[PDB]
């Protein structure tokens, strides 16, 4: 769907900012995003608990699909 296509492009952007890790860290968000937007992401991204998880790992994929994608499923 069009919403999924947009969300995937956002996911791809976060993935680059995360250096191709499957999650992103708060320090990477603060490094790359405007402070208000970094804080929003730090507060609202769900924790990443998949393979390779670490304390503080943030699930940018789930966050992006909820915000821009086909979220009502």
């Amino acid at each position: 769907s069009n919403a999924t296509d947009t969300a995937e492009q956002v996911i791809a952007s976060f993935r680059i900012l995360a250096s191709d890790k499957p999650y992103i860290l708060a320090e990477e968000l603060r490094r790359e995003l405007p402070p208000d937007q970094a804080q929003y992401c730090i507060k609202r991204m769900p924790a990443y608990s998949g393979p390779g998880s670490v304390p503080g790992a943030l699930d940018y994929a789930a966050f992006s699909s909820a915000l821009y994608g086909e979220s009502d499923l």
Partner: peptide, 20 residues
Amino acid sequence: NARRKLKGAILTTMLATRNF
């Protein structure tokens, strides 16, 4: 409105600030 404005700004940051 608040969420709509915030997510539009984030979309600009994520898609329209780097040459990705």
